[PDB]
Nucleic acid binder design. Structure first.
Ligand code: ZN
Lengths: 100, 156
RNA sequence: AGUUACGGCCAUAUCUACUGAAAAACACCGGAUCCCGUCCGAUCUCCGAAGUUAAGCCAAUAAGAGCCAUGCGAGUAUUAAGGUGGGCGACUACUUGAGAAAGCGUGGUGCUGUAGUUU
RNA sequence: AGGCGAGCGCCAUGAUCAUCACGACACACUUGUUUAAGGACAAAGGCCAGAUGGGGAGUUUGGCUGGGGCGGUACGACCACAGAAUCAGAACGUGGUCGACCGAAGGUACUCACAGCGAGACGAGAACACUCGUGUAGAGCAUAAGGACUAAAGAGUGCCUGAGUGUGAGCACUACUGCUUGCAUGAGGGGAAACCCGGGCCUAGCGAUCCUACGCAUACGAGACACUUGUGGCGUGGGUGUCAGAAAAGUUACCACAGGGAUAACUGGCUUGUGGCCGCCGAGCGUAGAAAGCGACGCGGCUUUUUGAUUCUUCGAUGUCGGCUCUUCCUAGCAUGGCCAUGCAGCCGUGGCGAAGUGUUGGAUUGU
RNA sequence: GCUCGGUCGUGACACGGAGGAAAUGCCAGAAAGCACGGGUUAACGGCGGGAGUAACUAUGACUCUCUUAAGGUAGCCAAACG
RNA sequence: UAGGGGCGAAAGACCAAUCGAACAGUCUAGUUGCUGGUUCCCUCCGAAAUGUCUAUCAGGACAGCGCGCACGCAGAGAGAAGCAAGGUAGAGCAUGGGCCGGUAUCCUUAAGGAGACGGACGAACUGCGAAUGUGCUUUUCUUCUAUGCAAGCGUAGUGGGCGAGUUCUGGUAAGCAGGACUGGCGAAGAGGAAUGAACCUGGCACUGUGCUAAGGAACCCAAUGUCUGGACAGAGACCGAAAGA
RNA sequence: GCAAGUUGAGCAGAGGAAGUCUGUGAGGCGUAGUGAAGACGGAAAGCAGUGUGAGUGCGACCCGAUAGACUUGUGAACUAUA
RNA sequence: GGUAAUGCACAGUGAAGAGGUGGCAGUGUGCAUCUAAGACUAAAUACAACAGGAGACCGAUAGCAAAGAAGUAGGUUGACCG
């Protein structure tokens, strides 16, 4: 699947159509200071073994394509969801018809 | 085993009749509908928006609400041994005006005359009910021109 | 009464040969300078009247093909209810009811709405 | 505080604190070398942290199934067939498909067809490019199957990113999911305009609570006030295919317990494919000649003595193969008695009929 | 599997470093192991297929071909092992 | 030398008639979706063995079918009369699949091929199309109806079914395995088929007199005789095929 | 029984007394809802008892495992070995 | 219950004379409230043996195991059992 690097679309904050910059969303790093991390650290602490379950019988191959789009004027962001695909490319050459 | 998609088992239903393929006729689009009319559903397979589920094909119901190019029709259905009302959205290409009230409306037109006179002259209407066909009538016959019947045909 | 513009129901209107047609139209027809579009003024777009009923459109003809109706096929095929009916079965007779199709014969061959024009 | 290369890093040595070997003493510590020998090492204790660890400890080792196991997946989805013409409707019933793919194969406006067949046109042939006439789809429509489509939904050509943003109501047995439809908005798109568009012509391509990542504004914050961290709310992603969602390998012939004829290993019952026995027909063969004796290719039966198929009875128990011993019954007749046919000279036979009274043995190898 | 040698890399806590008002984080550091190179079967164990070819026929000493960590030697056999 | 321990010329042998983990006592009345049992009378009403989800298949929960209390009340497991939808039985072989033979004529060969046509066919072929069954409106439409219906609230049992008639799928079949429709036995006695869960007649408080059903009427055993044709086989009343004199 | 209200909380005063009568006097639920919250606000008789059907937890209708653990409890008079 | 530590310990480290706390981690600053690392204390509260009084309790297969010479007759190698 090929996606262009730019898209003119409606910006909710500006309340009219504007140019946006287009790219794949990126998963950030887990923080030790959140309530879930704190709870788990304390529970693991003693001689208690493994205290929470871990998935082993996994089954899926792909994961869903998700695009982050940024408004060039006001820097606000929107998230667009596009379904499952094994491979993704940004800004490659057009699928020109009637090749040799 | 069978499957359970939205258009399961519709090979015979949802197919055009012989020498009747193509889009609908102008009369379909120029018919005006109103709340409270009785209407009859027959799906046109060539139109892919506003199709009802195939249970409703060939059933008749009553118009509840009217929109730009679609209608909402009320139906009743038995589920788990109880009666349930159902509100079905249909596009105007898949409906035709029902004939089911025709005779009753004629009868009302006759009643509407009598019920006025019944205030002036009588006290109660005669009301013009239908009656089922009675016994066989009496006959007077001239008795010339007799025809005899016989087992002449041997039927080898 | 036809035609023509815009229609309704979508073959009684289709397909193949032939033949007719006052008037007014409808056409074929004559050019590309411009607007517009082509490998190509063939098609599409524009500007025209020297010609012509040869064509189309309209109408007639044909033991024509196809379509539409009706009669017959036929109370035939199949079928609902019933009995301590029959048959080793496969299946089938009877009593009170409902009731076809293909073939084949005979007839048809568009009907109409609103406006405009022509003895 | 010195020196090098167009104040930089690089090369010299001079002051300031830890610090690793090596020596030489004896004071901790060690040893019945004890009025002694070793010596800050050893050996022995303590607190944290990595590695190894069936030596042990706990526990687990899905379901459906013509009994279980091995095999398949009828375990989540989609089309067609059948189920005596609404809808629904079982079996490890039938023919198949799915866990994706695509900036166009998405949205709009306009133009024109196609597969073939009959004539033509140098090289040029069965099969090269160009034309004329016919052409209801005999073609195409990415990917199963069905349905749909003709001045198009197919093939080309132009422009666009609606594969917008808030918030309602409903349909499929309706939670998740998929689709249909209302109102409001965009310094939205395509088209002259009427019209159409919030993915793919329609029916399939998918996933809760808690935790965590990101986007969006509006909240909270402990006696008070400021900031760095944190906690709330809505929406999407990260995943459970056993697909309405536990974190999981074997073996027991040393074996235990609760139950089951809801379910196997005998017999019996129903069935008779397979096993065995009998009829019908007459192509050919028999030295001539269908039929003394045979009888291809086909067709109809009977039996329960073989082995299957099924699970009705028994799992708080019906003692399981063969032999020994002893009795009775059946006939589809091997001998013995009476007869008929003959390819019956006689002798020996072969095919059939009524008949179950009396007979049908001794041994070698082998559990048979 | 056991055993021997070196690090070239990884690999804990402590001990340091930079920054910030401070917490939390970040960076360095890092034995033995692991990786890497050798030894070892009276350690666990393991030890092949296909074609042609000799003056009757058969059989193949001989040849070619695929393959490996090595392709079952000396003996023994329808053996309590066919 | 003592129990997750001993001892063993090794058999999981032996450790007070106990050993593939001793005895005593306690926690403890451990747990059980599994087996057994569960104590007086009469009156009235009366089921289910099906759907969805479940580490679910000998169990649950939700819904469906009972009963009790009942605010209230024009309704109905039947017909007519207008109106819709359907692709089965029959019938056919016009698109698609597909068997055998063709006159004239045509094409070549001097073979064969095509053919104006006839016969034979499909669960996944259709050009036509029933009966029976399904839904809508009308009491302004016959006929019944209070000793009747009944929202709502609370709560039970059930979730192994089996059989007849008519039909269907798998299988050589089966008292075999699995669906659909209308009544049964389950939970149903009485009279009849000699006997039999389900077949025929026909639904049960307690007495008395009459009458009929189904099935019987020489005798067993309450009631029996008549007329007309067939039939001779230790036949038939109870009973098997193709083939035959 | 009382009703926009209601109640035997504990505890005090009286009384030849485990009864009864009287006080003082909390709390709880109700008198109207909406949101996570900041915040806002606009329908519906309740409270306490005496009993019956029914759910959940405790031995939980009655009887019934093979097993698991704990003791500063016992045993080599049978049998094993020094 | 105590949630970026409610209390108690062990090893390293280790104060100030001024310190501790104000149910969410950190740094600063006012405000409120207390004074740890030494000791003693009545009343109102809990419950066997033994004694006394009561009861909608049981009545010799019941009620404590035991209404008489009952933890007895009797039993285990023993602990213990009855
Ligand atoms: Zn913006």
């Amino acid at each position: 699947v090929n996606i262009p690097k730019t898209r003119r679309t409606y910006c909710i904050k500006c309340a009219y159509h504007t140019e946006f910059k287009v790219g794949l969303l990126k998963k950030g790093k887990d923080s030790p200071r959140k309530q879930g991390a704190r709870r788990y650290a304390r529970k693991q602490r003693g001689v208690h073994g493994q205290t929470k379950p871990i998935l082993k019988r996994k089954a899926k191959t792909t994961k869903k394509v998700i695009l982050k789009i940024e408004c060039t004027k006001c820097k606000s962001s929107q998230l667009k969801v596009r379904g499952r695909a094994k491979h993704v490319e940004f800004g490659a050459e057009k699928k020109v018809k009637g090749e040799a | 085993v069978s499957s359970h998609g939205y258009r399961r088992q519709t090979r015979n239903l949802f197919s055009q009749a012989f020498r009747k393929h193509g889009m609908p006729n102008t009369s379909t689009y120029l018919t005006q509908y109103a709340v409270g009319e009785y209407v009859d559903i027959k799906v046109n397979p060539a139109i892919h928006k506003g199709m009802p589920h195939k249970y409703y094909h060939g059933r008749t119901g009553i118009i509840k609400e009217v929109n730009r190019g679609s209608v909402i029709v009320l139906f009743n259905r038995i589920l788990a041994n109880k009666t349930v009302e159902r509100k079905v959205i249909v596009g105007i290409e898949h409906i035709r005006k029902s004939k089911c009230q025709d005779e009753y409306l004629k009868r009302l037109e006759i009643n509407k005359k009598i019920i006025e006179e019944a205030e002036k002259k009588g006290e109660v209407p005669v009301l013009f009910k239908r009656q089922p066909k009675g016994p066989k009538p009496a006959v007077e016959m001239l008795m010339n021109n007799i025809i005899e019947l016989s087992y002449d045909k041997v039927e080898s």
